């Protein structure tokens, strides 16, 4: 399914933008994949 893969990309980046709207910056350099995808034991969000 190609429509579902475009939903998964647009859906996951909305969850990341919610963390970027809690702060006052949507700038890409301030938010690496280490911020979102590191597990909660290391201090990250634990996003799958």
């Amino acid at each position: 399914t190609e429509p579902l893969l475009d939903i998964l990309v647009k859906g996951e980046t909305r969850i990341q933008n919610r963390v970027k709207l809690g702060l006052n910056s949507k700038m890409p350099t301030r938010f690496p994949p280490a911020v979102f995808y590191t597990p909660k034991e290391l201090g990250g969000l634990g996003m799958i």
Partner: peptide, 27 residues
């Protein structure tokens, strides 16, 4: 080049729109 593949734009897509040819599909 845009040979019928890719996106109409990368604005509302939440991607970059970067298209690369599948090296796996050759024969």
């Amino acid at each position: 080049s845009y040979n019928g593949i890719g996106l109409k734009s990368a604005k509302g897509s939440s991607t970059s729109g970067h298209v690369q040819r599948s090296l796996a599909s050759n024969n």
